[PDB]
Amino acid sequence: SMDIDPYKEFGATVELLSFLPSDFFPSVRDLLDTAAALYRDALESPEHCSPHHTALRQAILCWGDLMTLATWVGTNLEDPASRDLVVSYVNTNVGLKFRQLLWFHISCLTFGRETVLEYLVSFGVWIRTPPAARPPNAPILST
């Protein structure tokens, strides 16, 4: 009966990240490509660097495990579309969680946590303003 919030220690919460709609978040493919492109040397490094790095390290690997289970279904699980349904669960339902988690951490390193959090409410408020009055410019993430 323990309840740990992956975001608590970084000044956010699961409720908060779910304020951004599903379709705001980049893909997992695109997210890992970006972590590598901007951070491989630090993630692969033997320094802590930041708490963010530590967490990101763990989430890439954890997504890894979920993906190596997804490959293992089929190549070991005999039945046909009862195999596809599992790999479909993995890539859409859990994938959303990790899309949230990875975004949060790459975006925090790239842009700074306090800037990430402000952009988060600002986009959530903005996107929910209906088209009728919602400005052309969604707010921006920068630095």
Ligand X SMILES: Cn1cnc(COC(=O)N[C@H]2CCc3c(C(=O)Nc4ccc(F)c(Cl)c4)ccc(F)c32)n1
Site residues (CB under 8 A) for a copy of itself? Answer: 1-6, 8-9, 11, 32, 35-36, 40, 43-48, 51, 53-55, 57-62, 65-66, 68-69, 72-73, 76-78, 82, 85-86, 89-90, 94, 97
Which is nearer to ligand X, 21 or 79 (by Cβ)? Answer: 21
Q: What is the DSSP letter of 40?
A: H
> Is residue 125 close enough to count as binding ligand X by CB under 6 A?
yes
Smallest gap from residue 37 Cβ to a copy of itself (A): 10
Which is nearer to ligand X, 70 or 108 (by Cβ)? Answer: 108
Neighbours of 2 (CB within 10 A): 3
CA distance 109 to 38: 10
Q: What is the DSSP letter of 27?
A: P
CA distance 9 to 113: 12
CA distance 99 to 26: 7
Smallest gap from residue 26 Cβ to a copy of itself (A): 16
125's contact among a copy of itself, ligand X, none, with CB below 5 to 8 A by partner kind, is ligand X
Which is nearer to a copy of itself, 22 or 45 (by Cβ)? Answer: 45
CA nearest neighbour of 111 among 133, 82, 81, 141: 141
CA distance 95 to 91: 5
121's contact among ligand X, a copy of itself, none, with CB below 5 to 8 A by partner kind, is none
